[PDB]
Design a protein around this ligand. Structure first.
Ligand SMILES: [K+]
Ligand SMILES: [K+]
Ligand SMILES: [K+]
Ligand SMILES: [K+]
Lengths: 86, 86, 86, 86
């Protein structure tokens, strides 16, 4: 249940956070562009095609990155502890 | 056998996925450009020189990223559990 | 106490290092721009919107990256060893 | 001795690989620019300021990325197995 609780809140961020981003950012004008940026930021790829200019968007992006690196550590723990037990 | 099964399906993506990408994307016009992008997307480097514009290409890129971060966790588990035994 | 000591020195960098960066770099002209770059460099996202041109800034950025990848490994160890105990 | 052998070959790549890169790439014209790119590629940051255009440089960059993600897994294993034993 510990793994499911960590991914459900992560999936919600990658779905809920792209919604306000469209309105506050002058570069983003629709949800598909913000959703694509969300995946890119959450997977720590960062192409640089879409970048938050406003400080409000930069604070929101920092949360996505902090939860993005934590997601990598959560997936790693799901495989590492799976073979360590037996 | 668990590690080999996870990497063979990963290598398959970085080989098969660059093929449709060339045709659907107007930016990519040849396989060497799409293959280079595939490694960059999988290793979670993301330079931003090659970016999927079409939504079809963006969905395909998301799979490459999800399997890309999972690959990092698979390589980490291969070293962490190796010394954990003894 | 081992985890707290590793993150307090990390957070210190993402707070202290953006200060000299503003003065030595001609691209950066204020702290909010350098602070945003610091989080992006530490989380290993790297958009490329802000880049160190001077060699002094490039040496400082390398420390942020080395401590950035070490931070990913520290968060992973905090979850992997948590369930490994029992 | 296992950890030292993995980092000495990695440090060598980030020092030796930037040397041929300067000559084969028309974008790179000196060692400090190629050395900066090497750190960026090895730490999986990828700003996109410096990108390999030639296929020769793209093959060399792929090795740096494969050894770059493996370096993250090596540093993680050095901390995870340090607390797991006791
Ligand atoms: K980038
Ligand atoms: K990256
Ligand atoms: K990364
Ligand atoms: K990047």
């Amino acid at each position: 249940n510990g793994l499911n609780r960590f991914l459900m809140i992560f999936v919600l961020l990658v779905i809920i956070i792209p919604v306000p981003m469209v309105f506050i950012e002058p570069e983003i004008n629709n949800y598909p562009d913000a959703l694509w940026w969300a995946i890119v930021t959450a997977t720590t790829v960062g192409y640089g095609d879409i970048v938050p200019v406003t400080p409000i968007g930069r604070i929101l992006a920092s949360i996505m990155m902090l939860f993005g690196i934590a997601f990598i550590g959560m997936i790693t723990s799901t495989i590492t502890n799976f073979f360590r037990c037996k």
